[PDB]
Design a protein around this ligand. Structure first.
Ligand SMILES: O=C(Cc1cccc(Cl)c1)Nc1cncc2cnccc12
Ligand SMILES: O=C(Cc1cccc(Cl)c1)Nc1cncc2cnccc12
Lengths: 304, 304
């Protein structure tokens, strides 16, 4: 029992982290096979970050201008290319610690672990979610760019995020490993609108099932609702609309607890309309939305 | 910016996890140098867990009865001994992945990362604290015994916890790496009193400084207090008494924000007396106590 914001073990990702320096800018890179992936803003100075022409800036750079260090040893750069907002530096050596991996573009509401890094060295690991507004609420300081987000299935690391930017609001924006930003963000030092951040309804329901599984049941009520009645409440409280696809994914948790998904929706409706009245659920005084149904099952079953 | 419940990167610990089986019981072990450390209840069946005489039970066991598997390869056991509540299995091979390490017994209020494991395989990592009542609020299922808690300083892993037991209340009890339980717990299937769990006052103040550093300042007030006035409030709200030792450790955070420690205490006093009024601090609707002053500085500075 017990329920925690749990990250995947980060070892497989630690073995891929390297330091990339170009000119006077240093950030993190991801070494997989003979390629190092990093944010393309590594070629920028603070001056051209205002309005950068990345193609024109990259023309002034050669393979020898990209310094890639793995621990204390230097990697020889034999190629460089730009794919969207990432640079791919071909090195002459394959990373001996390259795990089985895939590049995946996650959907909003999905969760992932982040290995925050500075100077190619890992500092910590935390769990977070891609927000409906395509930002992440991370914890990142200057030098953290190039830190990656990932999920792990048995021995395979699915890289889903690369950190690039912090918005003036203190929230984070980044790309998938093909260099495509999540959301409307551009890699420019210009104020950018994040957008309304709604609550991930299916994840709150998954966490409510996690609460029942671990003993917290005070919020269970004698009511039920329908998808349309529930969604009227969800709209009012800036929660994502719940669909039959969401109900279907909550099936295993509904079967584990014997609580029909619409009955759990009625519990959520009452919690939204009445608040928690000073009570807690899984050590939290608010409704948690950064655990997916898969996360709850994985944590409550022990998948390694 | 951003503040997260961040764990240390777990790679150094993953390389030490092994599976230990004795009879029909399988749990995790920690392989460092040529020794495998595991909870001594690995020698028990469910029947003798009611009242085990570990010395008499260990007499029926030989080196060949302890099956130690590292990944898919078997370790040869050449020695076994019991130290308090842990078994030390001497193996014929030193772990090639043994990091620089120390065994430390942490104080209540201190935090650490946990690498939850099942069958010698890591499933996830989370941050937690040794509670004032010497329990930890972990997330552990059957088979998680032998999973360890740790801190990392540059390249050195300080192992501080080994998981042994879940109390009927769903909270967790374990030992240091010398096999001494934290708190009054015994390794027996008997109901055991955890004790009153108070809030780690110095950690809540550290998290309030973390909130100011990251922009959340609504709770800052025009008041101050004294240690004795504050402690009257702390006693009333089941918070640990604050001492000058606690004020001294909050020095760097007080210097970073320009907020005197007793002024921050007055903010905490008002939050305790008035609640949060439906507001949040660092994405939380309650006062967080599982970040030490060291954790806040480390996260807000980027120590790798
Ligand atoms: O945001 C940037 C630099 C930047 C500026 C404009 C566009 C782009 Cl793509 C990147 N770096 C940081 C990332 N995360 C967190 C930080 C915290 N403090 C300072 C800097 C941080
Ligand atoms: O508590 C025990 C077994 C046990 C019983 C009495 C004494 C001692 Cl030292 C150990 N194992 C578990 C640990 N953590 C979490 C669990 C969750 N579910 C089942 C079992 C768990």
């Amino acid at each position: 029992s017990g329920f925690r914001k749990m990250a995947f073990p980060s070892g497989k990702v630690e073995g891929c982290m390297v330091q990339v320096t170009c000119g006077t800018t240093t950030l993190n890179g991801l070494w997989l096979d003979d390629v190092v992936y990093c944010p393309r803003h590594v070629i920028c100075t603070s001056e051209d970050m205002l309005n950068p022409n990345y193609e024109d800036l990259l023309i002034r750079k050669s393979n020898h201008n990209f310094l890639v260090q793995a621990g204390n040893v230097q990697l020889r750069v034999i190629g460089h290319s730009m794919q969207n907002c990432v640079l791919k530096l071909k090195v002459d050596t394959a990373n001996p610690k390259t795990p089985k991996y895939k590049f995946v573009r996650i959907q909003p509401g999905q969760t992932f672990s982040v290995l925050a890094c500075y100077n190619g060295s890992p500092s910590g690991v935390y769990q977070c979610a891609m927000r409906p507004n395509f930002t992440i609420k991370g914890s990142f300081l200057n030098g953290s760019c190039g830190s990656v987000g990932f999920n792990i299935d048995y021995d395979c690391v699915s890289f889903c995020y690369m950190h690039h930017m912090e918005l003036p609001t203190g929230v984070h924006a980044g790309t998938d490993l093909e260099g495509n930003f999540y959301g409307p963000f551009v890699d420019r030092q210009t104020a950018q609108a994040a957008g309304t951040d709604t609550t991930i309804t299916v994840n709150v329901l998954a966490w409510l099932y996690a609460a029942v599984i671990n003993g917290d049941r005070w919020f269970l009520n004698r009511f039920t609702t329908t998808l349309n009645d529930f969604n009227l409440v969800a709209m009012k409280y800036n929660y994502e609309p719940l669909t039959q696809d969401h109900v279907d994914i909550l099936g295993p948790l509904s079967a584990q607890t014997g609580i029909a998904v619409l009955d759990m929706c009625a519990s959520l409706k009452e919690l939204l309309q009445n608040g928690m009245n000073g009570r807690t659920i899984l050590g939290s005084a608010l409704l948690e939305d950064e655990f997916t149904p898969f996360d709850v099952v994985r944590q409550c079953s022990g998948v390694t």
